Amino acid sequence: TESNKKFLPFQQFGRDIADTTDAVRDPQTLEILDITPCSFGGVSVITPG
């Protein structure tokens, strides 16, 4: 996903609170681009009996 934060040369990756890494540099053009855990949840069934 889009990356709106900004860095410096001393800044390659920036994780956020709970220190979770998400800010990939994208070294081919030097445009950081952020990431996100591709979500999911539990599953189950509903049965009356």
Partner 1 sequence: VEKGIYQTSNFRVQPTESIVRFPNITNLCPFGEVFNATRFASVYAWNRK
Ligand X SMILES: *[C@@H]1O[C@H](CO)[C@@H](O)[C@H](O)[C@H]1NC(C)=O
Ligand Y SMILES: *[C@@H]1O[C@H](CO)[C@@H](O[C@@H]2O[C@H](CO)[C@@H](O[C@@H]3O[C@H](CO)[C@@H](O)[C@H](O)[C@@H]3O)[C@H](O)[C@H]2NC(C)=O)[C@H](O)[C@H]1NC(C)=O
Per-residue string for binding with partner 1, 14-43, x by CB under 8 A?
------------xxx---------xxxxxx
State the nearest-atom distance from the C-beta of 3 to partner 1, in Å.
15
Which of 1, 20, 28, 47 binds ligand X (CB under 6 A)? It is 28
Chain gaps in the chain, named by the residue before each (C–N > 2.5 Å): none
What is the size of the binding site for ligand X (CB under 6 A)?
A: 3
Size of the chain in residues: 49
* Cα angle 24, 28, 12; round to 5: 35
